[PDB]
């Protein structure tokens, strides 16, 4: 290229050093100690006893060669509360007579159609621990008498069985392990203000005995502790269970996993962020605390919190730190979690219904924010070091402006420009023979550096010509040789890319598999057994 001479037409300087901000090397975090609470989805489970008399009434046609069961009528009948506390508890015996009401009439059944007697409750043969039963007879009385007549006999079997009882929210009923549903709150009482609970029976059905000592029917050992014993007579049994107040045995919030080294991130303005590196989750709550007077039955979320915040306060941080407030901070987190947080200061320093989903959103929020905060810190340092490197390099670009001032214009602009040093500012200006054979060969064209031909001789009279080098020896041309060997001061930075990873669906158990667990399925058993009369009999035919 040919270079015209620069004039004083257009001047320009170099850009000076420039300032640039700093990365945020400090966040407003608060180390603490926290426990987490979820929705209680588990029912209220308690122990109970059932007392009934199993009455079967069998009728037999007695033939000459055989006997045939005509009727077999089984009814279960309640044992009165006076007989629970005066013969079963005192003596371990039960009368062989059942008096009960049925079709609004007082009716009576006698065992073996005989006079009543007290019979000892013996244990069942199949009695295992937790599923213990007691019964008076092992026989079912049947009268098989003379030929040609019907004969009816009556068995009365007094059964005492230890059952488990379950109650689900709002605790207006409970169900026994026999399958029986009791339409009454298990927290009902006629005393100490427990009468506002739901009773679905007559007042004569219910009865409560204060200062009761349970007597075990195998060991005949009265218990050391007393209890208030509720009694309820049903048309089919009497259930007996221990009374406890509702607010002491039931919460709507259940304890989930604890967090030893919880950090309360307040870097994002307007919200809190509870990060546990041991759980692997970050929970985002608001600033205002939860009012635990608004949640129904949420009263153990603060006494079980402080009993376990303090229980590991005396295990990890006692010599190095102290708590603050003596009442933990209770927050409603995103997704339905209750974060009972307690700060940890240094030694040198209309009800609400809470429904809890899954915690998969908090694992992603932990994983994203921990990889966000590192790549913003890392790339805020390479930005701060690139800004500083270009400032100290500007001293080197100014020193090659006093000597060879035309190289700094070619590098800064891009086109092969020519600059002259006009004091402290630069002015920019934007038939080929081989050579004359007789320092630099700048004589005539038909020759400085970087293929720039001068319009004069300026030397004392290799050289690079185009894409070649012309060799001279004692000021005489030889050949246009090439050089393959090249030195390079360029540092290399080979940065690859993240390859794409596809995430196919992957579940350990599917929905059909997780519902096919259990011996019996009630919807499949019923849609086979209610087809029984249509499958093995003829309903649509009518005799005449």
């Amino acid at each position, epitope marked *: 290229y040919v270079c015209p001479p620069p004039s004083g037409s257009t001047v320009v300087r170099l850009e000076p050093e420039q300032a640039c901000p700093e990365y945020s090397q400090g966040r407003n975090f608060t180390e603490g100690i926290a426990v987490l609470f979820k929705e209680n989805i588990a029912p209220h489970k308690f122990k109970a006893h059932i007392y009934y008399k199993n009455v079967i009434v069998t009728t037999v046609w007695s033939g000459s060669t055989y006997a045939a069961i005509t009727n077999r009528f089984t009814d279960r009948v309640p044992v009165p509360v006076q007989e629970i506390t005066d013969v079963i508890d005192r003596r371990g015996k039960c009368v062989s007579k059942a008096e009960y009401v049925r079709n609004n009439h007082k009716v009576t059944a006698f065992d073996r159609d005989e006079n009543p007697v007290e019979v000892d409750l013996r244990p069942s043969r199949l009695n295992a621990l937790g599923t213990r039963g007691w019964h008076t007879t092992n026989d079912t009385h049947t009268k098989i008498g003379a030929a040609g007549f019907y004969h009816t006999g009556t068995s009365v079997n007094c059964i005492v069985e230890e059952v488990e009882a379950r109650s689900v929210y709002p605790y207006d009923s409970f169900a026994l392990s026999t399958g029986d549903i009791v339409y009454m709150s298990p927290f009902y009482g*006629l005393r100490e203000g427990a009468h506002g609970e739901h009773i679905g029976y007559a007042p004569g059905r219910f009865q409560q*005995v204060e200062h009761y000592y349970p007597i075990d029917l195998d060991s005949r050992l009265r218990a050391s502790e007393s209890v208030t014993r509720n009694f309820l007579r049903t048309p089919h049994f009497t259930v007996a269970w221990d009374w406890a107040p509702k607010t002491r045995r039931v919460c709507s919030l259940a304890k989930w996993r604890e967090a030893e080294e919880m950090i309360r991130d307040e870097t994002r303005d307007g919200s809190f962020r509870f990060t546990s590196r041991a759980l692997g989750a970050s929970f985002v709550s608001d600033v205002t605390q939860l009012d635990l007077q608004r949640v129904h039955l949420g009263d153990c979320v603060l006494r079980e919190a402080s009993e376990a915040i303090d229980a590991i306060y005396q295990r990890r941080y006692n010599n190095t730190h102290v708590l603050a407030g003596d009442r933990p901070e209770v927050y409603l987190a995103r997704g339905g979690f209750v974060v009972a947080f307690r700060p940890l200061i240094s030694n040198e320093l209309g009800h609400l219904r809470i429904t809890t989903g899954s915690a998969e959103f908090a694992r992603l929020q932990f994983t994203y924010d921990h990889i966000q905060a590192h790549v913003n810190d890392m790339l805020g340092r390479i930005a701060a070091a690139w800004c500083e490197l270009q400032n100290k390099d500007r001293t080197l670009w100014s020193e090659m402006s006093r000597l060879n001032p035309s190289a700094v214009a070619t590098a800064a602009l891009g086109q092969r420009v020519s600059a002259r040093m006009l004091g402290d500012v630069m002015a920019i200006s934007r038939g080929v023979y081989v050579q004359n054979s007789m320092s630099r060969p700048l004589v005539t064209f038909e020759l400085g550096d970087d293929n720039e031909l001068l319009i004069s001789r300026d030397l004392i009279e290799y050289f690079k010509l185009g894409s070649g080098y012309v060799y001279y020896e004692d000021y005489s041309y030889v050949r246009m040789v090439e050089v393959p060997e090249t030195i390079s001061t360029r540092v290399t930075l080979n940065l690859t890319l993240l390859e794409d990873r596809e995430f196919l669906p992957l579940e350990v158990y599917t929905r059909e598999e997780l519902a096919d667990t259990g011996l019996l399925d009630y919807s499949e058993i019923q849609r086979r057994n209610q087809l029984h009369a249509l499958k093995f009999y003829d309903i649509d035919r009518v005799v005449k």
Partner: antibody
Amino acid sequence: EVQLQQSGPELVKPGASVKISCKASGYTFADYTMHWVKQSHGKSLEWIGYINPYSLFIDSNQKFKNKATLTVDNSSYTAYMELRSLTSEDSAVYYCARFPPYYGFDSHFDYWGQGTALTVSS
Amino acid sequence: QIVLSQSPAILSASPGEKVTMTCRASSSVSYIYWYQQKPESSPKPWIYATSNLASGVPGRFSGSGSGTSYSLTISRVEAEDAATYYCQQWSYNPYTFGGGTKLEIRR
């Protein structure tokens, strides 16, 4: 019929001790609790406490924890109330009442005594 | 203790007038139990379980109420019904009787 025969009027000097009886007839004595009430002259009824004459459990009032003790013999079918450390504010008619050994809807003082006039004077 | 404040202390009714009396409880109790006492006699059970009448009491006595408000009303008052009437609870320790309503038949 159910009858709760109770003791007689007793003039007793201050600082002494009085045992007041209540004899039952007409029911099985050992499966009903026996309660005691107090009625000063011209005023209302105050509950002392009870005794269960099968488990010998006594539950009493906190105003009468140091002024009354309750005992029952199983033979003579009687209940007793021992009033001690007497004051002139302990002059009343003291009744004896029958109550069930459970708490149902029909648990009430179904049969009463006839009263013992107690007088603390000189 | 549960205070059982009986509003009409003395009540003067005329034989034939429907007269009510109310017992006000401090906290909520399960049931209320009414007792009648005359001068120089033991108390007598009169209404149990807030609405059930005892043995040998005329049907003109009827009681109603729930929670902290209870009431005893007489349909047609007679001269044999002049006595004092006590409401009573056992829902808490100690058992507490009310104040008393002296009914005076204004003849």
